[PDB]
Design a protein around this ligand. Structure first.
Ligand SMILES: CC[C@]1(O)C[C@@H]2CN(CCc3c([nH]c4ccccc34)[C@@](C(=O)OC)(c3cc4c(cc3OC)N(C)[C@H]3[C@@](O)(C(=O)OC)[C@H](OC(C)=O)[C@]5(CC)C=CCN6CC[C@]43[C@@H]65)C2)C1
Ligand SMILES: Nc1nc2c(ncn2[C@@H]2O[C@H](COP(=O)(O)OP(=O)(O)OP(=O)(O)O)[C@@H](O)[C@H]2O)c(=O)[nH]1
Ligand SMILES: Nc1nc2c(ncn2[C@@H]2O[C@H](COP(=O)(O)OP(=O)(O)OP(=O)(O)O)[C@@H](O)[C@H]2O)c(=O)[nH]1
Ligand SMILES: COc1cc2c(c(OC)c1OC)-c1ccc(OC)c(=O)cc1[C@@H](NC(=O)CS)CC2
Ligand SMILES: Nc1nc2c(ncn2[C@@H]2O[C@H](COP(=O)(O)OP(=O)(O)O)[C@@H](O)[C@H]2O)c(=O)[nH]1
Ligand SMILES: Nc1nc2c(ncn2[C@@H]2O[C@H](COP(=O)(O)OP(=O)(O)O)[C@@H](O)[C@H]2O)c(=O)[nH]1
Ligand SMILES: [Mg+2]
Ligand SMILES: [Mg+2]
Lengths: 427, 124, 419, 427, 419
């Protein structure tokens, strides 16, 4: 029925900021708030004019959350759904989860309940956060534990920003990610990983931006997100509810991390070119070059595929284009699973930001696939980690906030297990 | 592949549907643990109130060098003042009663002028 | 989020007064007056070095400490002398020393409090104190001695916040003074315990930068200080400027220092004296260009950080950078993944259209420490000028006890050329 | 900050007289008192106390146990230079024996002096130390000095004492009993004094014959040459300086050890009136023929060198002057003082007395070196002593004032020790 | 700083009255009147011999003592007779003696007081009394006997100040008497106890010095006194003159006398009768020229002091001087280092363009003493003229007791030809 957004931590917020903007452009809410159920999914029709998101934003420095209450959309949120922490996270799980987190954690948890209080039959939570990064791993994890307690059934859906060398990481990133994803895994239901590498890579191949910004990246992530939610703020069969999510993408409780693929990212100025074919957009989907976690699934196996088409599209085509995707490619569905394909068409044409870099399109695909190769990312983190922790590398700054040396061990120990589970799903 | 597709749901703003391509063939978050967050909280006040009551170690060792000096000085002053003055009553006592060890050895070949001129007023 | 600046002792004070008038003129600040510069950015993070007072006006969060008049009134009467808040000058009056113990015990502890009472009045004033940064000499006393004490007395009063220093490790060239090894070794010890990062400005390097590579025949403290002043503006840049990163300085620390033993960064610069990008990096990573007297060759990099300056494409920087750690691939430890990161701010320094600066946690810094403990054990050998301290209240074994800590530091660095 | 002069005893005074004269010629104080040099309502302040609204009065006190010499001051011009009080005179002479001045005849005046020097250090915010000029051998010169200094040590705890001894030589007439006097004072006085500039009268007289070409050199002849060495040692803190350096650093350099060490004095260019190279003057310093205590240090070892240049010099020159005063000369720097060769330049020209014998020069070196061979003087005294005391020679005149037989022993006993300490600094 | 002059007994008085009129005319003094001499120096230290009175006028600090009129009115009526202060003449009246005891006990002590009451007057008058010097004969009575007593009564009253005497040690050739050895030995004893230095003018030398070397057939007390008067000017010079030294006379003592047993100097002179520098020293250090009858050859010099007179270069003197202690190197004890010192005053004596005088603590002076105890023990042998003292109130054994003290003195000197 209702669907709260929690965006913790710089990345999470900035992502959140530029996909609420896209939700607004899609549903036609001029910033102030007013539009000239249906899309009640995400908005709480507050007062007798405005539309206010069902959002809460937490970060442990102001700064970023500050830019929201400064730039237009400044009238979009309630002043209280924006929480800010004064003292920074300092780029380590240890801080956010225990030291500096403790402090603010009871405020947030309160406010999200204020928001789910005006909700007859709330569904779940969308949680947007950074994989590596201070509060992003730390706080998120903590939030999520306590969420699990305060809200028993209610699904949690995480959208992690898995980090990559160039779009600048931090030495200590590896730790943070392994750390959270341990604690956070048993508490979260489905998790859309987003490889920053992938996105940046798409902005270079496709958009032709030599030096892609966050604000550049975010825009492209903004769309993937809109397209995954879409189905439930419009209501257009498939993923019309949160259960129905992991119901279709993960068959294995182990929070599985579906692969994100977006359809036609084409740079405006190439706008009035040709509208791409129902077939072809699909055909991009099954392309490494267009993925969303730097990997490849012509090496792994598929365990559930989901195609999310948006626009003017008739099933007849989708079918008869899949046909030839099967006839002309690397099928590779694993051992004990149909050969998936739950296909949803959402007749709503895919709106893009106006000064944005991509162009208005006709029709876009989305592709949500649970592959065992998504664990090639799982491993690449782990190595970096293994080889630092071999020497206690930075360990101390965390023992310093007050963690256990063995919470590092007992978390790697989990990744090793999950890295093995995934691989153990092979034929 | 030649499809066979079963349709689930036909909304207002959309259509979904399943399409199998080849039959599959085969066959507590629990609250209590936040005492594990005041398990940090009281491992981190240790960490600190140690290397704090450990910098309170070096603290009044300052009270010490700033003392072993001042105390070191009055040990030199109020030591070689009587290492001087007690070698200078040592001095007085030594001459002040040697200028008089000169005088009494004279007043003797003197009280001897009298006791042999009061012997010349007895002689020839 | 906000940092106070302690600047103590003749050398300390000199350096900091150049630091100040460089950055002040970068942000565009009058002797007293406020902004004058057709840029805008500047004022964004002006906050971080500048607690502001009456009307317009901009006054640096700065505490000037020293044990004798002169060198303060050297600043007061000179460059940006009118700038610093008048009751922010903590005079000594007394003897100074040129002798750690004087500054760390007898003549020093005499003051400390009155300085500490003003740091309190700046830090307690601050919206959210990030930490303190301090400048001083390591040889000689009123900087090295009072300093090591200020900080020992600052932690304890703020364990909370982090400690930053610029410490000028002194040399046999550029000053005679039979004792510094002693003072240096007595501080290095202090430093390793109570700071979180320290930049080692080796005077020995500084010299050589002016004579080995510069032709400057009669080297002042002046030109040579001009080198530090520049290196410092660079090191700090992305605390006080843009919106590239944001740089909690805690962030800088928790990213630069793998090992609690506060590892000292040797800094580096790009162009110098008183530029192509490839020709910039290959120069910023040259030994003959390091701010500390080493050759980061005998020993590897634990972590590196480089920050560039001027409207140049970072298309070319990512690429030059990854390219150094390739034609030099072995000398970046491989147990710490992406251990060299870069940042780009595009607002030029003094003259200078391009520029870069370099912060390096390098085990080769060991070569420096060894060489101070070298002329140390050569002296403390047969207990040399030691009676200069003995008499001021110090123990014989506090030297061995420091000599031995320092020797450890050397041999933990020497250890982290591992596998 | 401030720096009091005490000149005790004929030699001390007469030396003092002709170097206050030199100070006055250097700073431009016409005997009258006043200096056309602009104010004094600091720096030139180290040695002078700007008394009243015209005059400049030294920070000096002169004691001697006969009038006679002190009398010469309040008679010849400069008669207006001092305050009447700062000149103390004793009526009954010293009689040429330590015993007298330290106990018998000194007792009497000692309290007067001690008072008046305090009157003088009373108008002094942060007085630094004392310069004490005295004779090694000689009545009050050994005796009174010694007493003064003990008591100084009491009345002024820290404040360093800087003695300028005039070590005595056979020809510029000594006295039989000289040897005793010197061994005696130097004992008592040693643990109370900080650094001591010995001046061998022999040396000076010797320099006045080689260089000045004076067949029969007067005290007034000698004093003039010592006047300069003193000026150049104080200099540093007398004029301001900038491009260089105070004692206190030169002090830390010279004396590595408790034992008051006695630096060698060498002057640079003594050339008779009726410009030498920066290199050459230096080369003169490392010459037996130009030293301040007859001996040689191509036989001893060096434990700290100090070069004090004055006048038309540049470092670029001193640099090569020194470097070469090593490449092919009497090297020898000992086991553990890596330094030695401190160097400052007190740009102010080396102003010489007008009817004097030396000429205005361009530039002068000064060389203050602590060598172990300076103890070759230590011994030459001791032997003279040993061999007299062997028979109680003159002992009695001292036992007669009221000394102990064993204060002669217990003082020789120290020289033997010091003579050994010095020699024990060898490699 | 200031000295009084006692001058007692026929011989003493004679000598002193020649002393006085030599120095008086050196400083330029009239019979009474004051200065007349185009020199200036003179008056610097005139203080030391000349307490001054009414108006101009200059009067010598002098006490004239004797036990019979004549020899005073010999001065009063003669040379500079108008000079001495009139109630400074202490007459005897009584018998004189030519017999120690008379002068040291019976007829002497009779007076002593009246002398002592005037020495008190001059000394208590003096600004800072340096000491007394006294002139007298050793043989015969009223000088030798009263003297030895004046001094024995002067010390005690001034132990403080030092004792100085010119004592004319007599002989068989040139005598008033048989008995002198007795008188001499009785004084020599007294001298060795209560004076600090004595100059031994041996009449025997003086005679040999006028017949072996001076063409004079039978010498008066005149040409002969003449020699002492010159020697005495010589000895004193640098108390009463320049600004060469200053010569506390205490200084002179504590430098000339190693051993408390007041060791007696034998004086000497340069040119004589009534000069090249080399030809001056070789003469001043010739035995045939000593004021005491020895041959400073049989015996060594303990300490020597030589003082030269006239405008001559001391370039040559230091050199001649060190040259005597080289061609005679063995006869200066080598256990007292620089035990020969020289001084130069450049204001000539009587006639005489050059000159020197010589003071010598020489163990050869033993030869003198031995030769007076020689004729003593030859007499006191079989108790000769002893009943001349016996009866005046003396004990038999006071002679042995004196003879034996003197004998010792001989054998301490004889000891200090040591190693
Ligand atoms: C930047 C501050 C500085 O100017 C650096 C030097 C020292 N002083 C400034 C003045 C100065 C220098 N030289 C002086 C000589 C006399 C008086 C003053 C000076 C200075 C220079 O030449 O500037 C033009 C200088 C000094 C030295 C100097 C160089 C130098 O300018 C190049 N040397 C590096 C040291 C030196 O001791 C050393 O470490 O040798 C390895 C060196 O020894 C030799 C033979 O080089 C030398 C050179 C003469 C020798 C003896 C004294 N020591 C002291 C330090 C050292 C010098 C410059 C402070
Ligand atoms: N895709 C994307 N990634 C971001 C963005 N901002 C930061 N990141 C990434 O997130 C990681 C850093 O996480 P942060 O959000 O900066 O850390 P945080 O604790 O959540 O925020 P702070 O408290 O400010 O440190 C790095 O991997 C970055 O590459 C963003 O706007 N978009
Ligand atoms: N250099 C130098 N030495 C002197 C001078 N005058 C005396 N001396 C030396 O100092 C020593 C003598 O010191 P004095 O001043 O005579 O002894 P004093 O007792 O202190 O002074 P007095 O009371 O006059 O005796 C001898 O070694 C002399 O050579 C002088 O003017 N210059
Ligand atoms: C009366 O005035 C005299 C006073 C003195 C001396 C002296 O003999 C030359 C005198 O003349 C007769 C004198 C004497 C002797 C010494 O011993 C050999 C000596 O070292 C030193 C001296 C004199 N001093 C000197 O020669 C040092 S310049 C000081 C005392
Ligand atoms: N570069 C820099 N270093 C200096 C300066 N002044 C002195 N030094 C060095 O630091 C040491 C002592 O500094 P100083 O400030 O005088 O010590 P303080 O007594 O603590 O103030 C010297 O040995 C020099 O090597 C300065 O001007 N700038
Ligand atoms: N040379 C010198 N000796 C004299 C003179 N008069 C006497 N004597 C000697 O001194 C001794 C006795 O002196 P005298 O005065 O008669 O004894 P007095 O009665 O004590 O004064 C004799 O041995 C004389 O040789 C004198 O004029 N000059
Ligand atoms: Mg963070
Ligand atoms: Mg004297």
């Amino acid at each position: 029925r209702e669907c709260i957004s929690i965006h913790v931590g710089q990345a999470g917020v900035q992502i959140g900021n530029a996909c609420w903007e896209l939700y607004c452009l899609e549903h036609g809410i001029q910033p102030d708030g007013q539009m000239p159920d249906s899309f009640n999914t995400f908005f709480s029709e507050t007062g007798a004019g405005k539309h206010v998101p069902r959002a809460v934003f937490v970060d442990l420095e102001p700064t970023v959350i500050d830019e929201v209450r400064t730039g237009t959309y400044r009238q979009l949120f309630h002043p209280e759904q924006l929480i800010t922490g004064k003292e920074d996270a300092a780029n380590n799980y240890a801080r956010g989860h225990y030291t500096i987190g403790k402090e603010i954690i009871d405020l947030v948890l309160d406010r999200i309940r204020k928001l789910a209080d005006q909700c007859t039959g709330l569904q779940g939570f969308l949680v947007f956060h950074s994989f590596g990064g201070g509060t992003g791993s730390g706080f998120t994890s903590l939030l999520m534990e306590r969420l699990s307690v305060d809200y028993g059934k209610k699904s949690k859906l995480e959208f992690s920003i898995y980090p990559a060398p160039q779009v600048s990481t931090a030495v200590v990133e590896p730790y943070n990610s392994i750390l959270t994803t341990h604690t956070t895994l048993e508490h979260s239901d489905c998790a859309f990983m987003v490889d920053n590498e992938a996105i940046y890579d798409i902005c270079r191949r496709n958009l032709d931006i030599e030096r892609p910004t966050y604000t550049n990246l975010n825009r492209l992530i903004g769309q993937i997100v809109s397209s995954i939610t879409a189905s439930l703020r419009f209501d257009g069969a498939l993923n019309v509810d949160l259960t129905e999510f992991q119901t279709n993408l993960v068959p294995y409780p182990r929070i599985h991390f579906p692969l994100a693929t977006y359809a036609p990212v084409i740079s405006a100025e190439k706008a009035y070119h040709e509208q791409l074919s129902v077939a072809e957009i699909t055909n991009a989907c099954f392309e490494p070059a267009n993925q969303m976690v730097k990997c490849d699934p012509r090496h792994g196996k598929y365990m559930a595929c989901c195609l999310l088409y948006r626009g003017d599209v008739v099933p007849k085509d989708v079918n008869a284009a899949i046909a030839t995707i099967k006839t002309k490619r690397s099928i590779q569905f694993v051992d004990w699973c149909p050969t998936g394909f739950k296909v949803g068409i959402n007749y709503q044409p895919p709106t893009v930001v106006p000064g944005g870099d991509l162009a208005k399109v006709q029709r876009a695909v989305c592709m949500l696939s649970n592959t065992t190769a998504i664990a090639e990312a799982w491993a690449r983190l782990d190595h970096k980690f293994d080889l630092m922790y071999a020497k206690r590398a930075f360990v101390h700054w965390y023992v310093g906030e007050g963690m256990e040396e063995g919470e590092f061990s007992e978390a790697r120990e989990d990744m090793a297990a999950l890295e093995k589970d995934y691989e153990e799903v092979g034929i | 592949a030649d499809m066979e597709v079963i349709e689930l749901n036909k909304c207002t703003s959309g259509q979904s549907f399943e399409v199998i391509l080849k039959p599959p063939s085969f066959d507590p978050s629990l609250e209590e643990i936040q005492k594990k967050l005041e398990a940090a909280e009281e491992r981190r006040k240790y960490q600190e109130a140690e290397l704090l009551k450990h910098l309170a170690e070096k603290r009044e060792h300052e009270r010490e060098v700033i003392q072993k000096a001042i105390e070191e000085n009055n040990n030199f002053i109020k030591m070689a003042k009587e290492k001087l003055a007690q070698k200078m009553e040592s001095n007085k006592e030594n001459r002040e009663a040697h200028l008089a060890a000169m005088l009494e050895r004279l007043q003797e070949k003197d009280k001897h002028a009298e006791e042999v001129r009061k012997n010349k007023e007895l002689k020839e | 989020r906000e940092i106070v600046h302690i600047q103590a002792g003749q050398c300390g004070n000199q350096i900091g007064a150049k630091f100040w008038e460089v950055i002040s003129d970068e942000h565009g600040i009058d002797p007293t007056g406020s902004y004058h510069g057709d840029s805008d950015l500047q004022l964004e993070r002006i906050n971080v070095y500048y607690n502001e007072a009456t009307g317009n006006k901009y006054v640096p969060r700065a505490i000037l400490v020293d044990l004798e008049p002169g060198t303060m009134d050297s600043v007061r009467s000179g460059p940006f002398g009118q700038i610093f808040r008048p009751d922010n000058f903590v005079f000594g009056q007394s003897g100074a020393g040129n002798n750690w113990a004087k500054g760390h015990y007898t003549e020093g502890a005499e003051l400390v409090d009155s300085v500490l009472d003003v740091v309190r009045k700046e830090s307690e004033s601050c919206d959210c104190l990030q930490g303190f940064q301090l400048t001083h000499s390591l040889g000689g006393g009123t900087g090295s001695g009072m300093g090591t004490l200020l900080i020992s007395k600052i932690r304890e009063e703020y364990p909370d916040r982090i400690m930053n220093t610029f410490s000028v490790v002194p040399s046999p060239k550029v000053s005679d003074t039979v004792v510094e090894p002693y003072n240096a070794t007595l501080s290095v010890h202090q430093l390793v315990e109570n700071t979180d990062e320290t930049y080692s400005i080796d005077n020995e390097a500084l010299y050589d930068i002016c004579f080995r590579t510069l032709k400057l025949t009669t080297p002042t403290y002046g030109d040579l200080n001009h080198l530090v002043s520049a290196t410092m503006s660079g090191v700090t840049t992305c605390l006080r400027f843009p919106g590239q990163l944001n740089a909690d300085l805690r962030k800088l620390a928790v990213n630069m220092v793998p090992f609690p033993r506060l590892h000292f960064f040797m800094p580096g610069f790009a162009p110098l004296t008183s530029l192509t990008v490839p020709e910039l990096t290959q120069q910023m990573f040259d030994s003959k260009n390091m701010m500390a007297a080493c050759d980061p060759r005998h020993g590897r990099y634990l972590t590196v950080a480089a920050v560039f300056r001027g409207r140049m494409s970072m298309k070319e920087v990512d690429e030059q950078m990854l390219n150094v750690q390739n034609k030099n691939s072995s000398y970046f430890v491989e147990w710490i993944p992406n251990n060299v990161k870069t940042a780009v701010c595009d607002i030029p320094p003094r003259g200078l259209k391009m520029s870069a600066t370099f912060i390096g946690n390098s085990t080769a810094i060991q070569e420096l420490f060894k060489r101070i403990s070298e002329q140390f054990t050569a002296m403390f050998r047969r207990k040399a000028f030691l009676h200069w301290y003995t008499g001021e209240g110090m123990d014989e074994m506090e030297f061995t006890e420091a000599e031995s800590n320092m020797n450890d530091l050397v041999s933990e660095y020497q250890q982290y050329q591992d596998a």
